[PDB]
Design a protein around this ligand. Structure first.
Ligand SMILES: [Cl-]
Ligand SMILES: [Mg+2]
Ligand SMILES: [Mg+2]
Lengths: 318, 312
């Protein structure tokens, strides 16, 4: 928030990115979905230009069990170590955009940094489609990849809305009776509402002098989730002791100034108490989804933590 | 943070503790160290009463290599799980107080929750003593414990100033040529200055830049370059750290330093774990009357239970 100086931990590069992130903030769209989607198409294309400058990858289109995916590989080839591994990426974009370039923006840095194949899923978006459409889509992709890869060697990750869907996909996979994935990354978001202090600090809910700050909702406000109960453990698994016990090893990663931080710190407590192997990282001073901007050492550092989590937690053998 | 509601994650018991914490806040002492020490003696005696009502432990005084300790155990004895393990506690208290009751306030909940022997160190305090006096004292106790316990089965933990001294003791043990401890807990502080956003949000600053050193008399005249004094800022010292638990309240001025320490340990390939308790301040877990404190004690116990060895 505005009274503070930039975190004194940030690289000069990051301080530059923060100025541009603030300057690049969306105008009010007033329900004009077409104008909103155009804005974020340009945003995602802009970050993809930055990704392609830093990383060397090759992308193919594929269809797996009637779901459209992009398969992103390092241009140098997958490492020997990762021959029998694969990651599924679930893009962010507020459950309403991010298809195509936003999906590549999340898949490219991980494919290149880990030296692994990343299958980024073109799941059904809101407002046209509702929960559990995205869960069904990611589970269909997962089901296809089990023909080629052991469950223990498959990771699933996503940023923001993609972190929410990654957690929801886990429960849908269990509902289908499939073996659970080897590990997941619930980045800047998980299967829980936003809670705690961080939504107030990040300015998602206004606070200050003369302001009667309201309580926070116990549901994600997106149309994708409208009408889904708090008590649906498959929709909100990190609030459910039962679905939390069944989670695979989980990475939770956020910027320090991300409205998601308080929810992820509580989710990590719950996973620890449930006996699940989880890891939490916070990058002080950085906002929600900071690692879609690759021109700072902090983003490369995040890609290394994501790669290192999967490299440690996923199985290797065919 | 006056414009914020209490974190909606907190138990009703925690919301009560928040009000008790505010009632218990120190007045301005204007550098009168005697009045300050008297206030914190009373503070620590008050938390000790709370600890004694919640947990059943026995405390013994011992001397190990000329350093005074209290040995804190569950009243009916250490668990079979922990027969070949011991923790060293290093108390907080701004490097100037916390001796005796402060030390028991950190040792009792962990001894009782884990079912383990906790040896809490009566280290030399500022301003009478300066760095590296406390590192020397903790290392002397560690040296004595190696007579009975494998290095891999010894943990060291402390809160606030004690978390700082824990990290500094690690480097001192290495300087002495001893085997490194099995695991440490750098709770609400580590071998690094307070940095990042959290000191501003916690309101321990009104904005100006932050210091690159710890401002305490204990550290006066120690350089930033002393990697033994500030190991979590040194790439070299960080690689040699043992498995580390970092834990703080979400509103603690230590949060940002610990998140960076955790990133540094991960990059260095050290096993580390971070937990943050949304809505709680610095050293929250000296107040045992809330589920969140019991939960913190269980994370501390779980970390040492997973990372310490079991061989005799
Ligand atoms: Cl962690
Ligand atoms: Mg663990
Ligand atoms: Mg690790």
């Amino acid at each position: 928030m505005s009274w503070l100086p930039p975190s004194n931990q940030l690289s000069p590069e990051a301080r530059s990115v923060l100025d541009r992130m603030d300057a690049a903030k969306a105008p009010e769209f007033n329900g004009d979905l077409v104008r909103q989607r155009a804005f974020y198409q340009q945003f995602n294309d802009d970050r993809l230009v930055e990704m392609r400058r830093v990383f060397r990858t090759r992308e193919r289109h594929e269809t797996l069990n009637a779901v459209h995916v992009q398969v992103v590989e390092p241009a140098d080839g997958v490492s020997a170590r990762n021959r029998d591994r694969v990651l599924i990426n679930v893009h962010g974009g507020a459950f309403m955009w991010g298809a195509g370039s936003g999906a590549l923006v999340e898949a490219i840095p991980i494919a290149a940094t880990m030296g692994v194949s990343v299958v980024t899923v073109d799941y059904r978006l809101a407002p046209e489609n509702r929960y559990p459409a995205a869960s069904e889509d990611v589970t269909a992709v997962y089901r296809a990849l089990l023909e080629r890869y052991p469950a223990a060697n498959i990771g699933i990750f996503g940023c923001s809305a993609g972190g929410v869907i990654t957690a929801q996909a886990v429960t849908w996979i269990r509902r289908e009776g499939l073996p659970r994935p080897g590990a997941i990354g619930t980045l800047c978001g998980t299967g829980a509402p936003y809670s705690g202090d961080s939504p107030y600090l990040a300015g998602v809910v206004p606070v200050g002098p003369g302001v009667k700050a309201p309580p926070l909702p116990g549901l994600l406000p997106t149309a994708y989730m409208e009408g889904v109960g708090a008590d649906d453990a498959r929709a909100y698994p990190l609030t459910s002791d039962a679905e939390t016990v069944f989670m695979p090893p989980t990475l939770l990663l956020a910027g320090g100034r991300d409205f998601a931080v308080s929810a992820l710190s509580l989710a990590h407590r719950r996973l620890a108490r449930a006996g699940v192997d989880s890891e939490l990282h916070l990058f002080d001073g950085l906002p929600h989804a900071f690692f879609v901007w690759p021109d700072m050492p902090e983003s490369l550092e995040a890609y290394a933590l994501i790669a290192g989590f999967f490299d440690s937690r996923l199985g290797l053998t065919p």
